[PDB]
Amino acid sequence: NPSNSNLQALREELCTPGLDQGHLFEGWPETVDECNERQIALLTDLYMFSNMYPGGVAQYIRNGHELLARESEEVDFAALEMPPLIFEAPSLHRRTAERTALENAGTAMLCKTVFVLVAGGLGERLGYSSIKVSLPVETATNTTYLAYYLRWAQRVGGKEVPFVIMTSDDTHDRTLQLLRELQLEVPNLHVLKQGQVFCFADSAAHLALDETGKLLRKPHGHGDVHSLIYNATVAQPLVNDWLAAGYESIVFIQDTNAGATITIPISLALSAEHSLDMNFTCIPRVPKEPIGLLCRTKKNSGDPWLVANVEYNVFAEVSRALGFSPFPGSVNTLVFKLSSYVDRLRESHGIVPEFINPKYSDETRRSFKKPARIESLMQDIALLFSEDDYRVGGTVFERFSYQPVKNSLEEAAGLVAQGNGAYCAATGEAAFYELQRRRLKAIGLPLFYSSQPEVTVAKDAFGVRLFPIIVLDTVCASSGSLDDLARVFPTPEKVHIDQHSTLIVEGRVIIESLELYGALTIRGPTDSMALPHVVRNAVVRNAGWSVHAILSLCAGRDSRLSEVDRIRGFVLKKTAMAVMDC
Numbered sequence: 399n400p401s402n403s404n405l406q407a408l409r410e411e412l413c414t415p416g417l418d419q420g421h422l423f424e425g426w427p428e429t430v431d432e433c434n435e436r437q438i439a440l441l442t443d444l445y446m447f448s449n450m451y452p453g454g455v456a457q458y459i460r461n462g463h464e465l466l467a468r469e470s471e472e473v474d475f476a477a478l479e480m481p482p483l484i485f486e487a488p489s490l491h492r493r494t495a496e497r498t499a500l501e502n503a504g505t506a507m508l509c510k511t512v513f514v515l516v517a518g519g520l521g522e523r524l525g526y527s528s529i530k531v532s533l534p535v536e537t538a539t540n541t542t543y544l545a546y547y548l549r550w551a552q553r554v555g556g557k558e559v560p561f562v563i564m565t566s567d568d569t570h571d572r573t574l575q576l577l578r579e580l581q582l583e584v585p586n587l588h589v590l591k592q593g594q595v596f597c598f599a600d601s602a603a604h605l606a607l608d609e610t611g612k613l614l615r616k617p618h619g620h621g622d623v624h625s626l627i628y629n630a631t632v633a634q635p636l637v638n639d640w641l642a643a644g645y646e647s648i649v650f651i652q653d654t655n656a657g658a659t660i661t662i663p664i665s666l667a668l669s670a671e672h673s674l675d676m677n678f679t680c681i682p683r684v685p686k687e688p689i690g691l692l693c694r695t696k697k698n699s700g701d702p703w704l705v706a707n708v709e710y711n712v713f714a715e716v717s718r719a720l721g722f723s724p725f726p727g728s729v730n731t732l733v734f735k736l737s738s739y740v741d742r743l744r745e746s747h748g749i750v751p752e753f754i755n756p757k758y759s760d761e762t763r764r765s766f767k768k769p770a771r772i773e774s775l776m777q778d779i780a781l782l783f784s785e786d787d788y789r790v791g792g793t794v795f796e797r798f799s800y801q802p803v804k805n806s807l808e809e810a811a812g813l814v815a816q817g818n819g820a821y822c823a824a825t826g827e828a829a830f831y832e833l834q835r836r837r838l839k840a841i842g843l844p845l846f847y848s849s850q851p852e853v854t855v856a857k858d859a860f861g862v863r864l865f866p867i868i869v870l871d872t873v874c875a876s877s878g879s880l881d882d883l884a885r886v887f888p889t890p891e892k893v894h895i896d897q898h899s900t901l902i903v904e905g906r907v908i909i910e911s912l913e914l915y916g917a918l919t920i921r922g923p924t925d926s927m928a929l930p931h932v933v934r935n936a937v938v939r940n941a942g943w944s945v946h947a948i949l950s951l952c953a954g955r956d957s958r959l960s961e962v963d964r965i966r967g968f969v970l971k972k973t974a975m976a977v978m979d980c
């Protein structure tokens with residue numbers, strides 16, 4: 399592709415007024431041949447950018463100028479208002495006729511759903527040096543987010559479920575390694591790697607270089623997922639392949655919110671009941687939260703309305719131009735009617751509106767503290783869905799079903815002091831255990847237990863509780879619907895799990911009657927279709943498990959403490975354990 403002639407032309411083009419990238423060729427020979435490998439390689443990098451980005455590096459620069467101008471002003475809409483199509487989901491912890499009806503319809507729809515996991519983001523802000531999807535959902539079983547999503551999708555959509563994972567340079571190799579180590583076998587998985595974009599050293603959009611003198615690169619945002627899907631093939635486009643196989647929905651999830659497996663079925667059912675082409679997953683928002691709001695927008699006067707996510711800072715500002723909050727918070731679990739999604743994809747080529755958000759070094763000088771780059775957000779695909787021919791709404795769920803692992807222990811302490819959500823590894827794990835319990839009680843399991851915390855973390859800033867710990871695998875519990883849970887416990891009044899107990903269940907298991915004071919693993923057939931291992935009149939007493947806090951005083955020569963332990967601030971002591979197999 400890279401003719402020496404085209405590379406000179408592009409070099410010429412980039413030095414023209416309005417592009418002005420002369421500072422890249424300081425001290426260079428007049429023509430390409432006279433250039434060395436190191437320089438000829440920089441030109442090549444610039445050139446090849448064309449097949450990563452529409453219009454290549456020249457268009458990228460121009461887009462930068464336009465965005466740098468745009469973002470010096472006040473993003474102001476002419477009109478802002480409650481989205482018309484908002485729907486309240488019933489509680490996840492009450493087995494009402496509605497909830498049953500919605501879980502049943504949504505669970506059937508799961509058979510015809512494409513799943514998309516965005517997992518290109520860095521996990522350091524947490525102070526976790528591995529990929530986020532390798533974090534455990536809980537440390538009782540240590541099941542990773544990656545396994546958790548994939549096993550659930552294969553359970554509800556069958557082994558051949560279509561699944562996409564977006565990775566980036568940061569997470570990609572480690573993602574393939576984790577798939578391999580978990581012995582996950584997902585025949586229709588596509589791993590699509592997002593490419594990095596160039597960075598701007600300054601307000602005039604001059605490209606930045608790193609230490610080795612190479613074009614500096616940063617991520618373009620989770621927005622990339624649409625174009626990556628648009629371009630992927632199986633000579634046939636991926637999406638054509640989905641449509642032709644009968645798939646009817648597509649859902650996008652983020653990398654560490656276990657709540658998605660509970661909200662999705664309900665969202666699907668409501669997308670169907672209310673004919674939604676795009677359905678944002680929401681929770682009631684607290685005025686301070688670092689979370690976007692679902693709004694009905696009108697950019698400039700007389701413009702059509704658009705239902706889109708918008709950030710708070712923008713919301714305060716725009717309100718100035720002209721119960722938690724009238725407006726819902728979008729958690730970025732996005733549920734689409736597939737045909738509608740494909741239409742918008744084909745027409746846009748998966749390209750969505752962009753922005754830039756430079757972090758300056760001053761409130762004063764237009765000087766960047768660090769190079770900026772153009773970004774995009776995957777939810778902004780909503781902008782391409784006009785109110786004329788598409789129905790875009792949101793479903794509001796209980797805040798509790800939103801359980802991301804976003805913050806370090808130190809961030810969470812500060813957040814909690816300001817009255818906000820910690821959303822850290824400790825409260826992620828705790829919320830997961832609590833979620834199982836609330837669900838199981840909803841079908842009549844009699845769980846009595848203290849609301850008091852059992853360990854404190856973050857230098858005594860706040861506490862969590864973990865027990866009783868009850869974890870059912872996807873063979874055991876299937877989709878996790880209330881009905882599916884009731885098949886595991888068909889006579890729940892005879893199952894007595896004490897507040898300090900641990901119950902781990904794997905495989906085809908039915909528990910009719912049990913008294914548990916301690917820790918127990920019950921294993922049944924790994925085959926979903928095999929004859930179940932049935933437990934009746936079991937009585938199990940042992941020392942069980944405990945949890946304790948990681949003490950300030952940490953050794954680093956002979957400790958088996960990992961980052962996984964440290965980011966939550968406690969460890970489970972797995973002191974004893976009864977096993978029932980067969």
Ligand SMILES: O=C(O)[C@H]1O[C@H](OP(=O)(O)OP(=O)(O)OC[C@H]2O[C@@H](n3ccc(=O)[nH]c3=O)[C@H](O)[C@@H]2O)[C@H](O)[C@@H](O)[C@H]1O
Binds near residue numbers: 564653729
């Ligand atoms: O959770 C929320 O409640 C918010 O999520 C969003 O905020 P964010 O600030 O983006 O935070 P963050 O956790 O970093 O990235 C999210 C995902 O994309 C992935 N991701 C990210 C960047 C990227 O370049 N590639 C990628 O795959 C990454 O791997 C992860 O899975 C919505 O925009 C916001 O409206 C709100 O819904």
